[PDB]
Write a protein that binds this ligand. Structure first.
Ligand SMILES: [Cl-]
Ligand SMILES: [Cl-]
Lengths: 175, 175
């Protein structure tokens, strides 16, 4: 049982909490974007899976776009509550959430909210230049269902919450 | 029970393993050098306590001397096995151990081993200059029961394993 505890300490890479939702979960991470679709935080088979960080994101300080995935569970668990952000009332009352990494906590300031079925541009993690990230931000701001008070520049860094399972639900916020 | 999991994710700051010992434990940490003398990794009252990192050590990259504490338990658990290093045969066969932090793993190269009852110079964590850490290293090398092949300079950084409860047992190694 302490073998399982050592496993958990490598696998769990953070914590996520959004007030007034079920989303209050450990963030897991493996070598791909698949294992934690099908396993819980104890590494046992489970359809609900876990909340998990994209395998490409391994540097908080430099990653321009860190992506966290979870199922849109029909029982309302995992990332089903991301859809509350399509209700304007909820968004105004919850402009931020908290994201812990392995080091420390951030209060993320949401600036874009949308659903998407076939346009997955938002999953880019690699930006040769600072100018490439500003093109990215322009595109995803335009994809948003709201115009945001929050301005954000190619100099900022962001975090993306996304379902992974018709359309995905996506929330993006400024670190 | 997920409230307890969130607690554990802030409290557990690393992992320690020394081959051929019981020492294969999570490293915990609180705001002082006392809580984890009396509580286990689930934060429940327990005499064995936990293995824990000195509250003063909060920066892997700059801390010249990171100290990890555990009880010298009479049932052979926790840090009772540190005393195996007074047997030369064991030390030759185990010149290193592994220390995980919140970020990553190190293979620590042991360079000093001793018991101490009243001379606690080794617990210094603050070194104004690089010259102060070289004075420190000179003192603790002299305190060692062996002369070490491993040389270490004021430019290196170290990790200290120590019991905490007649004498403490102390192992110090190069990062
Ligand atoms: Cl679409
Ligand atoms: Cl002494």
């Amino acid at each position: 049982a302490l073998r399982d505890l050592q496993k958990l300490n490598k696998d769990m890479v953070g914590w996520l909490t959004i007030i007034d939702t079920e989303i209050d979960y450990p963030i897991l991470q493996s070598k791909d974007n698949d294992y934690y679709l099908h396993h819980n935080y104890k590494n046992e088979k489970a359809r609900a899976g876990s909340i998990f960080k994209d395998y490409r994101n391994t540097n908080e300080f430099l990653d321009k776009n860190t992506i966290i995935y979870g199922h849109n569970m029909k029982d309302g668990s995992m990332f089903a509550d991301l859809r509350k952000y399509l209700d304007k009332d909820f968004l105004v009352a919850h402009p931020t959430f908290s994201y812990e990494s392995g080091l420390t906590n951030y209060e993320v300031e949401i600036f874009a909210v949308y659903e998407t079925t076939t346009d997955f541009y938002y999953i880019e993690t690699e930006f040769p230049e600072t100018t490439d990230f500003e093109d990215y931000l322009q595109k995803v701001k335009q994809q948003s269902v709201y115009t945001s008070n929050v301005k954000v520049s190619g100099k900022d860094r962001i975090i993306t919450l996304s379902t992974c399972d018709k359309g995905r639900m996506v929330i993006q916020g400024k670190l």
